[PDB]
Symmetry: D4
Subunit: 204 residues, 8 copies
């Protein structure tokens, strides 16, 4: 029937679009403590799984502000495309070149705002033949209407809507591949899971 | 794959349907301060991008009331079709004529109520072969159920659900085309963005 | 493109499924004051537009309770199928016979609970070739999850999700067909509209 | 048109995935009192309808914890696959073997978390040709975003989204098949229905 | 300890302040169907218990609009003070004179907006020595912040916050005083109670 | 300063007012699964701590319905006052005589609806000198406005607003008094605690 | 009884504390469109009623940012105290001296964040003998918990919780004092009122 | 008037009650990411201001679980009272002796669950003459009803309801006392503030 097009840690690249200091103030559909944790979780999983990662920003030398320091620090050697004008990152030639240079068929995309910086390149990438996976809990926007309208638009085009924990699990496939590593990622980003670990660890 | 059918500032017309004084009191799915800002934002972007715009009202000489003054004042030369009876604007011959006279393939539609004044002509237009883009945050209705039911119906038919900021960004494409102009539109309609500008401006 | 399959007052029948006194206590996804008004609005529009209407109940001589008095009183000559056991009304031969006897291609369906008494016959009817329109604001269920899951299932099958005011507007098409009649229906079921009428009437 | 692919009590198996003590603490999209009742309702209906049932857990000898006692106690002879590493149950050979051994075409799936333990095997099963029915109110996850993203993904693939009461009704088809039995299931899991029964019973 | 200052049907007057057609459009803290039902319930109970009732409006010949027709029709002989400018009804001499002429110590107050038309006269009345009971569910305002701030202010001054059903029960005291009358009031304004009545009646 | 007037298991009585099958359908401020669990938790703790308990109903032979079976079954020897007309239970002589016969200074009260069946007797009791503790999560009403207004009124009079778990902990004081007993109460009424217990037990 | 301590336009001063561009990004308990409108409404009413107004900022030459431009522009001659370190404005000598120099007994306070920049000086002022009125809808903070805790603290101390429209009406007292002026204030800050005005005006 | 009883960094002690790994799973009134951040923020501010801090746990060798690792690690020399049975920490002699040994008049309290582990000792402390400040956003419970009922009870007794950021600002008083220190605390626990800092720093 419909094939299950699942994330393959050897055929996926991560695109982090415009998670900038100024732009994050516009994010109100997901509260800040949760949003910050989710964005950092996504960066950590990209690093953990060793997925080619591409960073891009929009007019960072203005109100939009610089890329949040964590991402910059975490991916010092990753392609960093500071777009001076193109709103849709896919319209930037350097950006597309970097994406295609990863040689990956699957693109895991997250950024701000959801309906512009994520949706535009997601739609462009789908037209180009890529398998697109949107991390909806690591992408932010004005409110639930701007968010849900974007979800509808991306889903309609064929984008798979996923969340960071789901992304990590589909990529990892098996705990035995590295229990401690995945457990650390989860403990660092899911207070409830960390608590379960604490109790289990002190008891055993 | 699925082509990205994106807004083209040279191939799009804006249809503002029944944003009337009386009818706005029926809008309860989007709070008034946000709704007013969004509707005015849509009018401002239509003017900014110079998109052929069509205004229409339903039984304005009754409880429905007159078109909100801002729109009337902003588009004094635009086609203004006061429909005496047709609920679906597409059933009004003058309305369809005005729409087709714009010569635009893409129609950006917003109005009240979402499930009637927006959905009916959106569905009619899709049947006629137009590419329809619904501005969900500049369209209002009774509640979330009447709204979401309409979204489902329009999406099912092929309408692209968008929000005003997304619409502006897809139309503009590149900041460099006119930075100050887009920045002004954003500053006037996004308090958070205006604040970022204020801080940046006083510092630089 | 996709044809706009709109309600035709001459080709539509209304199916009111299990709006029973006991069963209404299970409805918690739509608050009671709004739900009661919406159900009565649907009955009033069915009567106003003279649409063949079919009433049905499930094990009414038990906890489920009798059909709410208003509907019984409003459609004294309509087919009334008290199903002794079949959960999906479409599984009741008398019910299907009554539906087909209306000779109508379009079926406007509402009832309780949304995911069972509305969804089951809606899906059965779609398989039989009928054009189905679900009145989502006149159908009730346990909570938003049971509701939204049902919406997804019905939409997936091809059901058009609509709300009562939208249904009335698509059926009427033109105010001039009978202004006072439609205005009365609206005034009786939309407090906000009634208020607009009051102000307009005392002023003119 | 689209066939109504409805649950058949003779052609359906139930898969209960990772409803573990530790993992249930991660469920925050559905409040605990409702979630517990729903999960137990699903187990009770599986038992009532005599549907082949498969239990599976993920790294139960760790923070994830043991399967909740109720399920273990209710299905002592059911296949119980304690997966030591595979996140997607479908990747476990014993699990798939047990599923296929039931000889059932329809799979009713529920578990935690929705977007991983339910979605992954649901998608895998759809690819294998099974008719999948997801019990959305007996599956739990972090929040509404992780949940709704998963719903979109499963629906997109062809999964039918259902809720436990709907599942029971589609399976039973007719009250007369066993009134007391279904009534007991409902009374035990729907406080509102139990109240209707109490009043009716004391009066009659 | 603190005395229970309860409503006495022989020492209470009802003040209905500014429930006008225009002003009701400003009420967004309580949805319209519920609000309409609650206001009409309060009018019905005032009439039922034969309580001296005072109607008052603010600049009714302007955007504020006329008093909702039902109240005017229900209390044709009640004092009706059309205030031409005084915002706080207590500042209008005719209004205060009317309140004092009732000879009642207890004042049941409701109106729109709650923080102005209800709060101002309630605070004035408390200063004057009256026992004030505010009907919070028959008073409307902009949002929950304007509402809750007013509740705090009124409660801080000593006003007793009540809701229409509670008001009716405190006034009635005993069902046996007139079962049918109170039952009718409840049936007409509480859909859930009406349903209970329908089931009970058809069975007995 | 202000003395901590805490629950004393030897000086407290429990008043369960009108938790009737019909009346529970009116409870919409607290969802049914949680509400049922909370009411049964209060009944369980009253039995566990051997507190003198008084059951009372209002017009049970009518739409209001019988007392929920569990309470009747749990307190077979408790005073059971079927009030034929008095809305405020304190106005019923048998009720007050029973309360006073317990000899308890502290009264733990819960019932439906909170603003009438709980608030009225609570206010009456406070006037009489009793220390009143309202169990807000085992008392139900129409919505949050009817609930919060009642809380304000009760708190204003001096009632202490508590919830069942807090009630249990304040009465118990020390785990060591009977660990297993309190643990069982908690396990039976708090799914999260039960899960903690399951994991801990299987591990130790 | 308790005196109604109402706003007197001749004995009130307005304190606008820290409505800075940077600090406004921290405000998430009230959405931005509404918040901006409310802050500007308060500034407009302060100017309209000619109330002595005091502007103050905290570390404006840093992340906190400059005062929003509108307030600066609207009150060019008002005392403007840039506090270099004192968090509670009352601890700044110039600030207190300015407040006392107004000679006003009543202080209308608003600012960000509500639990610090508003609450601290409000509590200080109350201790000093001033009558404090907090504008809760023109004060912003992190979330509803930080907000409601502050309301509790301020109310507990004796502050009167008000909202901008209520503030305007209490100060104005009578429409006839200047109908057009108050009407303009309302029209500019309440979309629903503006709509009422539009319909009324076009009709008359 | 009422004195402003403000936090004094030299006369305040911090009581962290039962923030245990198991018990945190019961916290559902505040989402986990925010709750974790708030608890860690309170621990950080207690350490920053060098306030005598007391850690206490309830039956930690059981389902309740161990104290979250961060608090243990942050306060290695703080009194740590493992209570073997006393639910209200004030009933534990070592606990009270430790509180009194600090010599502090003001007690900043936080813990889980708010209506038991925080409320009980807060009420006990108030009776003993202490000035109690409850950190409502670093205290967790089952839901909003259990939370708000506790707030009411604590406030009624005289406790001051505060939140961590407010606590930090009231203790600090002046930025100049140590700008970098307070800024770091804020940056580490308020993503919005951190973003403001990032933009400001890169620009200056």
């Amino acid at each position: 029937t419909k094939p299950y097009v699942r994330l393959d840690k050897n055929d996926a690249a991560v695109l982090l679009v415009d998670h900038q200091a100024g732009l994050l103030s516009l994010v109100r559909d997901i509260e800040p403590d949760k949003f910050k944790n989710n964005v950092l979780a996504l960066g950590d999983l990209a690093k953990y799984f060793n997925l080619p990662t591409i960073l891009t920003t929009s007019a960072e030398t203005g109100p939009n502000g610089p890329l949040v320091p964590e991402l910059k620090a975490q991916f010092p050697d990753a392609p960093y495309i500071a777009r001076p004008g193109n709103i849709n990152a896919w319209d930037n030639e350097d950006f597309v070149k970097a994406v295609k240079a990863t040689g990956k068929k699957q693109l895991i995309i997250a950024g701000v705002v959801t309906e512009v910086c994520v949706a535009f390149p997601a739609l462009s990438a789908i037209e180009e033949g890529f398998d697109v996976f949107v991390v909806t809990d690591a992408s932010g926007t004005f409110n639930e209407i701007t968010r849900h309208s974007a979800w509808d638009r991306m889903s309609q085009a064929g984008a798979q809507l996923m969340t960071w924990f789901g992304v990590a699990c589909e990529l990892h496939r098996d705990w035995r591949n590295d229990i401690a590593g995945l457990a650390t990622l989860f403990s660092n980003h899911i207070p409830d899971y960390r608590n379960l670990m604490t109790s289990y660890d002190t008891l055993t």
